[PDB]
């Protein structure tokens, strides 16, 4: 019984769990205690489910008498279920603790054991991501205290009219202003900046205390709605200083933390790859490839001799086999597939009548030919030889689908969805002529071999989304019903809608807009109501982790196997071909000063180009640097002339000519405004690029990026090919359907003319006449190019929820929207994001990582010296003892003993934390007593810290105190905090930001953090030219945008406003930074479309001549290029720091030997390294075992062995430091034998690590 269980008592319980999961989805949360019959039936099925669970709990309890975590989860689920049922019966919130049933779907993981393994693989590589979760916590706290000492309470005023107010006439979205004494936004002509305002977003986005700032900093770190906060601060305090906060916050907490996380994950995924390689899981894929090749390579013997004729069907088969494989049916079927793609991609909205007949007759004349080829494939090759090859099973699928989908279209049952578009996948056969086919086939082979892993990793992601959908639906079900007219399409009302909302939060787009709604649904910016943001924070930070541990893992662990498979094929082909052939047949220009001065002049010209006035034309600034170009080109013209005589042509020299030329052929037009000038000026922007050839190190990175982009071409091509098919499907589904009338009552263009009355702010007593306009969506699936653009801006995760809910409403061509007509059409978008936004954009990053790893693994000197032994011997050869400065004076000795110990350091580490806590309690609306208490507390803390500084200066003396890098930054904080006090007793805030900087001392202590940060910082410093490509790209694109879109008028109702414009180089760079962050960049692109008003200053013809059609190729290309360059820099840093990222810490290394160096300490002061004799005899006693030894007996055979390890060329009296080092390194690992003393000296000297005679101190 209590052991009888059985086997079928689990499978029954699992089915009950699934039934509970389904019954939890049909439930509909109603707004205000409403209900229907289905909910009443589910409330009684819950009783049966609880009875079953209680019976299970009791039976399992009496078999064991529960220590397992899963059993504990079951127990605490059933107990709280009983509690909820009893409380509901008693009270006849009780209906809030039913949110423990959304935890029942977790029992599915308990049931199937193939998912427990994957769940452990998921939350086991999270422990490494705990030194990057603490750095994030420190950065958020530091920036929240800094923005609290800078922006506390400064965003509580807005324009209010000068009549009957209390309303904010600052338009539908009010923005903070400033009184006419500061430098913030000034109210309009007929408005007044008055205090007494709630806040920018109902009071949730503020810096009023260390609860509202900790959330604003997190939201800005997630790179969502950070420009909104930056602009709100810009409209409240000024525009000069606030950008330094929000730019550094994202550079450090969103572009460096992301790099750290990516590096740790990519180094963590390589250890398991090594473990699998040691176990030998790649062999199974290796054998399957060759055996399948031979199992198809030997079928020709059967098929070529199946029709031996010693009735007469040989008439055709003896030539059908040749004809269909004679390089004619290849280039003819490819041509037919090209024609089919032509007829599929030529369908737009409102096409001519002949085109729809051409595409109706070709779609049949080509299907007939493909079916004829189908029957010929079955005949000339045989049935089995047809269904061997993978491409030959998908082609049968496509042809049978075409045949079965013509019927549905001709019989008028369902509307076309796109089926023949899968025939364009056959265009991949073009790769067979080049070498980019073995890798592509191998990648698909690995993807198909790993299916029980992909479909199992996606199952936990689906379970996560389902669980967080039911929990969110219980929390916010029906509570999003606000009085305002907006329907709030992203709610938690049903299961499909709550799934869409959770998926949108997972992608991250507008994740803060849903949380701002879930906060007001539980009250407002109050204490208990706002504790609901923990749901969204946890969902975001635990969904974007599984989204990087499920997709990047697949991409990396499959693309690493694909490379090994391709290498195997290449090696086998090379060996076989080699065997076959062998077996069968047997001037002052070149000076430094000129180059350096020309490089300096290049920078001068670039800065002169970046300082031009975009909007203004007749200005003095556009004259001086419009005149310095005259002299500037004179030097550059000269430079070519006297260097021409040294030659009689490299491509860089041709570029420098071109450049010098434009300039030249420009101030000579001196008349032809006729564009020309204005299309020859936007070509000076090539100046920076003439420094590539004169800045060796900058040419190398350009060449490396060119090799990288040549290598990654297959991924881009097969991603564009897939996006094309998705665009064609979108055209089939949504052509001419996403049209809307301004009046939401007319569903026809002929019905959408005239005017209509709209009521402002949903007030029936405030009528307003507005015109009726039949308008399309911002991005529409009308033709194939518009579909491509819309899908691109969907894959960038920008504005995709708007397009999704506009596509859901569309029902018929030339008709308006219908609320939630086809919600099921969201599957198209979900699939697109899953494939083209989560999988294919991670395959590219995995490919970059794998290629860089292969480049780094090329030879590595390939000569012994195990991967740690290089550093071990290098350190044993270039390690010197460290200074200690034991005080000589007897009093200074006691003082330095006081400040050198755990007590003083750990008490300072407590005072620092107390000071930060005291800095954290700073609300908006503090009493005078609170503030004057804070002042005295700050004075006391700074007095204590300056007394600590005095003590340290006295103990360590002024060279010793100042030598430590951490005691020179402590001096600056003390001076700033000591200037702060005196200036507070009568630019004062610049010194108030010094005290909060003392918190970094706590981040300094403790390994892990201090090692990862240092290694990544020195990796960023080791590659200063990879990060200069991004600077060059930003400069060039900012100048181009400045020249093109400079003159667009700044209306605050559009996306080119006072805050976002191209009218200055800093502002253009900020706009490009925002676009790189991916913050409504498509809105800026649309606001830069042709047909806008020019600025009043920039010069009738001025109807709408501002804005160019260049915006598409500007913004899309900038996005792609910036993403490529950022990923290049990230992976370059990761691979430069790939020793720390995978170190296998159970072995010796820098951690186990820098300890040594220290452990020498005592037995040494200033350098020297001479032993006490009694050190070599007390060693192990402190040294740790996994490196040296474990506190055991000095004569332990193994420790006496440490004595057997004797003089390595020195003197027993005083070991020359390094001595013991090597000795300990040699005994720890790579133990050699007797007589291998100069043999080791040549084991290093003969290949690498030039000794430089140093063996004078190490011989034997
Ligand atoms: C940027 C501005 C400032 C930061 C504070 C200070 C600058 C002045 C600094 C003195 C520190 C320099 C000394 C230093 O080296 O610092 C590092 C830590 O580096 C960080 O993590 C540095 C952590 C900094 C993180 C800053 C993020 C906070 C946000 C900035 C807020 C700024 C916002 C302002 C907004 C203004 C709006 C108006 C500490 O020491 P270490 O990690 O380098 O390691 C030492 C040593 O360097 C040896 O080289 C090392 O040997 P190996 O590792 O084997 O090579 C030994 O390491 P192990 O014992 O573990 O084996 C250690 O003996
Ligand atoms: C790695 C790649 C990183 C790329 C760079 C990241 C982003 C850096 C953004 C730097 C510029 C930010 C925009 C900015 O400075 O704001 C413009 C604002 C102009 O203000 P204004 O209209 O004059 O109104 C004054 C009100 N009293 O500001 C000013 O008042 C002028 C401030 C000048 C800032 C110069 C620094 C720019 C460095 C670019 C390189
Ligand atoms: C190799 C294949 C995929 C090439 C595809 C190109 C052809 C089929 C497509 C791509 C973009 C298409 C154009 C997109 C938009 C318009 C505007 C309108 O006036 C209808 C026709 C027209 C002009 C389309 C004609 C067909 C078109 C040119
Ligand atoms: C841990 C993840 C999965 C979910 C986190 C949910 C828990 C920790 C949070 C999120 C939403 C929170 C609720 C939000 C608002 C209110 C209303 C008020 O009466 C105070 C408590 C109460 C009811 C909170 C209790 C705690 C709560 C339920
Ligand atoms: C990226 C490399 C080129 C460094 C950039 C430095 C140069 C191009 C930048 C840095 C500081 C900038 C200046 C900062 C402030 C102003 C005042 C503004 O009213 C007109 C532009 C002007 C005068 C900027 C021109 C461009 C500028 C000189
Ligand atoms: C934005 O620009 C001006 C500023 O008032 C004005 O024409 C209008 O508000 C906006 N432009 C258009 C074309 O609506
Ligand atoms: Ca966004």
Curated annotation (Swiss-Prot):
GO annotations of cellular component type: cilium; cytoplasm; dendrite; L-type voltage-gated calcium channel complex; membrane; nucleoplasm; perikaryon; plasma membrane
Motif Selectivity filter of repeat II, residue numbers: 507-510
Effect of substituting residue 321 to C: In TS; likely pathogenic; only with cardiac manifestation; decreased current density; associated with slower inactivation; altered localization; increase in late calcium current
Activity regulation note: Inhibited by dihydropyridines (DHP), such as isradipine. Inhibited by nifedipine. Channel activity is regulated by Ca(2+) and calmodulin. Binding of STAC1, STAC2 or STAC3 to a region that overlaps with the calmodulin binding site inhibits channel inactivation by Ca(2+) and calmodulin. Binding of calmodulin or CABP1 at the same regulatory sites results in opposite effects on the channel function. Shear stress and pressure increases calcium channel activity.
Origin superkingdom: Eukaryota
Binding site for Ca(2+): 224, 509, 798
Quaternary structure, from the entry: Component of a calcium channel complex consisting of a pore-forming alpha subunit (CACNA1C) and ancillary beta, gamma and delta subunits. The channel complex contains alpha, beta, gamma and delta subunits in a 1:1:1:1 ratio, i.e. it contains only one of each type of subunit. CACNA1C channel activity is modulated by ancillary subunits, such as CACNB1, CACNB2, CACNB3, CACNA2D1 and CACNA2D4. Interacts with the gamma subunits CACNG4, CACNG6, CACNG7 and CACNG8. Interacts with CACNB1. Interacts with CACNB2. Identified in a complex with CACNA2D4 and CACNB3. Interacts with CACNB3.
Protein family according to the UniProt entry: Belongs to the calcium channel alpha-1 subunit (TC 1.A.1.11) family. CACNA1C subfamily.
Protein's name according to its UniProt entry: Voltage-dependent L-type calcium channel subunit alpha-1C
């Amino acid at each position: 019984i209590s052991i009888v269980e059985w086997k079928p008592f689990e499978i029954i319980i699992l089915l009950t769990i699934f039934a509970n999961c389904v019954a939890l989805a049909i439930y509909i949360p109603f707004p205000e205690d409403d209900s229907n019959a289905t909910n009443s039936n589910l409330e009684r099925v819950e009783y049966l489910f609880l009875i079953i669970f209680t019976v299970e709990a009791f039976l399992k309890v009496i078999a064991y008498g529960l220590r397992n975590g899963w059993n504990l989860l079951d127990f605490i689920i059933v107990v709280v279920g009983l509690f909820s049922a009893i409380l509901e019966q008693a009270t006849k919130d009780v209906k809030a603790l039913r949110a423990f049933r959304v935890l029942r779907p977790l029992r599915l993981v308990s049931g199937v054991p193939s998912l427990q393994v994957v769940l452990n693989s998921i939350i086991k590589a999270m422990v490494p991501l705990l030194h990057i979760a603490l750095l994030v916590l420190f950065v958020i706290i530091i920036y929240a205290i800094i923005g609290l000492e800078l922006f506390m309470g400064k965003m509580h005023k807005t324009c209010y009219n000068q009549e009957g107010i209390a309303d904010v006439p600052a338009e539908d979205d009010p923005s903070p202003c400033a009184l006419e004494t500061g430098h913030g936004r000034q109210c309009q002509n007929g408005t007044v900046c008055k205090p007494g305002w709630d806040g920018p977003k109902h009071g949730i986005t503020n810096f009023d205390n260390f609860a509202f700032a900790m959330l604003t900093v997190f939201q800005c770190i997630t790179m969502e709605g950070w420009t909104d906060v930056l602009y709100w601060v810009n409209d409240a305090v000024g525009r000069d200083w606030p950008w330094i906060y929000f730019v550094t916050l994202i550079i450090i907490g969103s572009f460096f933390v992301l790099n750290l996380v990516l590096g740790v994950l990519s180094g963590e995924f390589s250890k398991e790859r090594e473990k699998a390689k040691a176990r030998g899981d790649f062999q199974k894929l290796r054998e399957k490839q060759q055996l399948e090749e031979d199992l198809k390579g030997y079928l020709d013997w059967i098929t070529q001799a199946e029709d031996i004729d010693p009735r007469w069907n040989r008439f055709c088969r003896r030539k059908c086999r040749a004809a269909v494989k004679s390089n004619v049916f290849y280039w003819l079927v490819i041509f037919l597939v090209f024609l089919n793609t032509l007829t599929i991609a030529s369908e737009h909205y409102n096409q001519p009548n002949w085109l729809t007949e051409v595409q109706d007759t070709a779609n049949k004349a080509l299907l007939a030919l493909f079916t004829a080829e189908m029957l010929l494939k079955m005949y000339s090759l045989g049935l089995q030889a047809y269904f061997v090859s993978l491409f030959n099973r998908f082609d049968c699928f496509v042809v049978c689908g075409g045949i079965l989908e013509t019927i549905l279209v001709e019989t008028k049952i369902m509307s076309p969805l796109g089926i023949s578009v899968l025939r364009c996948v056959r265009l991949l056969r073009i790769f067979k002529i080049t070498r980019y086919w073995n890798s592509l086939s191998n990648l698909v082979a690995s993807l198909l071999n790993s299916v029980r892993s992909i479909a199992s990793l996606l199952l936990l992601l689906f379970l996560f989304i389902i669980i967080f959908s039911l929990l969110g639906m219980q929390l916010f079900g029906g509570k999003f019903n606000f009085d305002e007219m907006q329907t709030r399409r992203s709610t938690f009302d049903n299961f499909p809608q709550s799934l869409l909302t959770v998926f949108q939060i997972l992608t991250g787009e507008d994740w803060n807009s849903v949380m701002y709604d879930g906060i007001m649904a539980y009250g407002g910016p109050s204490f208990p109501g706002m504790l609901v943001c923990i749901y969204f924070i946890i969902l975001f930070i635990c969904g974007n982790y599984i989204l990087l541990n499920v997709f990047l893992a697949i991409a990396v662990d499959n693309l690493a196997d694909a490379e090994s498979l391709t290498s195997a094929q290449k090696e086998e082909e090379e060996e076989k071909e080699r065997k076959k052939l062998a077996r069968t047949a047997s001037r002052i220009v070149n000076d430094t000063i000129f180059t350096n001065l020309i490089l300096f002049f290049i920078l001068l010209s670039s800065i002169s180009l970046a300082a031009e006035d975009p909007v203004q034309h007749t200005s003095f600034r556009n004259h001086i640097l419009g005149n310095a170009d005259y002299v500037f080109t004179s030097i550059f013209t000269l430079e070519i002339i006297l260097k021409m005589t040294a030659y009689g042509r490299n491509y860089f020299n041709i570029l420098d000519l071109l450049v010098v030329s434009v300039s030249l052929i420009s101030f000579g037009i001196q008349s032809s405004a006729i564009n020309v000038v204005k299309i020859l000026r936007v070509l000076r922007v090539l100046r920076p690029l003439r420094a590539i050839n004169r800045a060796k190190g900058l040419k190398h990175v350009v060449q490396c990026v060119f090799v990288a982009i040549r290598t990654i071409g297959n991924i881009v091509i097969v991603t564009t090919l897939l996006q094309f098919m998705f665009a064609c499907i979108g055209v089939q589904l949504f052509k001419g359907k996403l049209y809307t009338c301004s009046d939401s009552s007319k569903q026809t263009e002929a019905e959408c003319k005239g005017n209509y009355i709209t009521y402002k702010d949903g007030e029936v007593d405030h009528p307003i006449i507005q015109p009726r306009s039949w308008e399309n969506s911002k991005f529409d699936f009308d033709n194939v190019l518009a579909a491509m653009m819309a899908l691109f801006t969907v894959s960038t995760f920008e504005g995709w929820p708007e397009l999704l809910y506009r596509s859901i409403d569309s029902h018929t061509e030339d008709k308006g929207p219908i609320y939630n007509y086809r919600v099921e059409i969201s599957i198209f978008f979900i699939i697109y994001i899953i494939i083209i936004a989560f999988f294919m954009m991670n395959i590219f990053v995995g490919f970059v990582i794998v290629t860089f790893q292969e480049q780094g693994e090329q030879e590595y000197k390939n000569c012994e010296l195990d991967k740690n032994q290089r550093q071990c011997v290098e350190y044993a050869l270039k390690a010197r003892p460290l200074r200690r400065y034991i005080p000589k004076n007897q009093h200074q000795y006691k003082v330095w003993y006081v400040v050198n110990s755990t007590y003083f350091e750990y008490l300072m580490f407590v005072l620092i934390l107390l000071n930060t806590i005291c800095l954290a309690m700073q609300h908006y609306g503090q009493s005078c007593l609170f503030k004057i208490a804070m002042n005295i507390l700050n004075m006391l803390f700074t007095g204590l810290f300056t007394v600590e500084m005095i003590l340290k200066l006295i103990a360590f003396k002024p060279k010793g105190y100042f030598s430590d890098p951490w005691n020179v930054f402590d001096f600056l904080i003390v001076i700033g905090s000591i200037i702060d006090v005196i200036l507070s007793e009568t630019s004062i805030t610049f010194f108030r930001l010094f005290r909060v900087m003392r918190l970094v001392k706590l981040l300094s202590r403790g390994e892990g953090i201090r090692t990862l940060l240092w290694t990544f910082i020195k990796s960023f410093q080791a590659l200063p030219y990879v990060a200069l490509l991004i600077v060059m790209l930003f400069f060039i694109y900012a100048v181009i945008g400045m020249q093109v879109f400079g003159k667009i008028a700044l209306n605050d109702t559009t996306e080119i406003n006072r805050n976002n414009n191209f009218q200055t180089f800093p502002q253009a760079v900020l706009l490009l930074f925002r676009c790189a962050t991916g913050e409504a960049w498509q809105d800026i692109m649309l606001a830069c479309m042709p047909g806008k008003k020019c600025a009043p200053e920039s010069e009738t013809e001025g109807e709408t001549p501002c804005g160019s059609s260049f915006a598409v190729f500007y913004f899309i290309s900038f996005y792609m290029l910036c993403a490529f360059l950022i990923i290049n820099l990230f992976v370059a840093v990761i691979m430069d720091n790939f020793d720390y990222l995978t170190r296998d810490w159970s072995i010796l290394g820098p951690h186990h030997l820098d300890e040594f160096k220290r452990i020498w300490a005592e037995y040494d002061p200033e350098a020297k390294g001479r032993i006490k004799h009694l050190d070599v005899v007390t060693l192990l006693r402190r040294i740790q075992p996994p490196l040296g030894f474990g506190k055991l007996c000095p004569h332990r055979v193994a420790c006496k062995r440490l004595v057997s390890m004797n003089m390595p060329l020195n003197s027993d009296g005083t070991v020359m430091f390094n001595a013991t080092l090597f000795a300990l390194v040699r005994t720890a690992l790579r133990i050699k034998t007797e007589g291998n003393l100069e043999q080791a000296n040549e084991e290093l000297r003969a290949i690498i690590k030039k000794i430089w005679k140093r063996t004078s101190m190490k011989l034997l």
